[PDB]
């Protein structure tokens, strides 16, 4: 009996974001090439949809502007890294800063 829904606790309990203190993070302080590439791609798409920038040197493509923002440490994004899914509905992340963190080769 029952249509697989009435007893179905399908709605997962909402999670609370716990941010690990800045002195407790144990992940690399250097952007992995995946993370740097994702940051550049997100920033460049957002410049395509919006167009605003903090650069002084004006470029003719959002890719170049986002790449320089990552290189010149003005990209307005925060890489958050998540390490847990606790049964207590408590997602454990540590929010890193791409401006403070090192930058891989990418070239």
């Amino acid at each position: 009996e029952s249509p697989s829904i009435c007893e179905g606790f399908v709605q997962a309990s909402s999670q609370t974001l716990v941010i690990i203190p800045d002195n407790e993070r144990i992940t690399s302080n250097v952007l992995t090439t995946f993370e740097a590439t994702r940051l550049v791609a997100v920033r460049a798409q957002q410049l395509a949809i919006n167009g605003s920038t903090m650069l002084k040197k004006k470029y003719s493509s959002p890719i170049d502007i986002a790449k320089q923002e990552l290189f010149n440490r003005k990209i307005p994004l925060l890489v958050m890294r998540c390490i847990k899914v606790t049964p207590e509905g408590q997602k454990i992340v540590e929010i890193w800063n791409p401006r403070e963190m090192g930058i891989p080769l990418l070239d």
Binding site: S14, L17, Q45, Q46, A48, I49, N50, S52, P76, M80
Partner: protein, 237 residues
């Protein structure tokens, strides 16, 4: 009835750069744009109170749109209708609607329908105002609709209960503030914890009914305009 309620929802942000400049104001504006005047999760959400919890503005992972979502957990004041509640005014729209229904101009947008099986039915006309009592079949708070849907008919632990008795005390002040000759005329026309709760609910229903009856009929000429209902109830003594 009105009561604040917490709602959890996920927004979508088509320009996260502009969104985060004034994050809280943008969240309030978007929640007002999306959630006011519409039913949600067995509620109506009359007004948006400030948010309680909100998420960081993530970026949509699964699509290359570059947008973000952000989860929002906010409180909002809603309007709910219980069983056999008393709303004092309905306004009919169409005469080719022989099933007899109408629209409500009160601060609880509800499409009200009245069955055509009772004696006091099929006699009304378009543009007249008639009090209607909700039936026992509850209220359909379907979502995405600018007004709720309902059915109705023409009317014929100690400190926990302190909050309930607190509401009725302020409602009495609402009755005294407004003009009392209309209230007197209308009252002449209509003349442990669980039982306390239901008794208090009935008291609330009747007192809110008389107050809304006083409010609904701003000027006295409509009373003669809608005089065909006075006899309709008076014959039912």
């Amino acid at each position: 009835m009105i009561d604040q309620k917490i709602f959890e929802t996920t927004l979508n942000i088509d320009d996260p750069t502009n969104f985060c400049t004034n994050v809280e104001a943008h969240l309030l504006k978007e929640l007002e744009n999306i959630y006011v005047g519409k039913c949600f999760k067995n509620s109506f959400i009359l007004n948006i109170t400030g948010v309680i919890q909100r998420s960081p503005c993530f970026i949509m992972r699964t699509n290359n749109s570059g947008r973000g979502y952000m989860h929002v957990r906010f409180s909002a004041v809603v309007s709910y209708l219980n069983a056999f509640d008393l709303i004092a005014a309905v306004k009919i729209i169409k005469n080719d609607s022989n099933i007899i229904l109408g629209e409500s101009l009160l601060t609880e947008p509800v499409t009200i329908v009245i069955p055509s099986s009772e004696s006091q039915n099929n006699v009304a006309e378009v543009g007249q105002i008639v009090p209607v009592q909700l039936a026992n079949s509850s209220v359909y708070y379907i979502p995405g609709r600018q007004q709720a849907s309902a059915t109705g008919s023409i009317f014929i632990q100690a400190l926990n209960l302190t909050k309930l008795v607190n509401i009725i005390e302020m409602l009495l002040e609402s009755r005294s503030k407004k003009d009392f000759k209309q209230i007197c005329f209308f009252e002449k026309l209509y003349y442990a914890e669980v039982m306390f709760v239901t008794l208090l609910k009935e008291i609330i229903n009747y007192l809110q009914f008389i107050n809304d009856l006083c409010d609904t009929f701003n000027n006295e000429q409509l009373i003669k305009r809608h005089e065909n209902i006075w006899m309709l109830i008076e014959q039912r003594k």
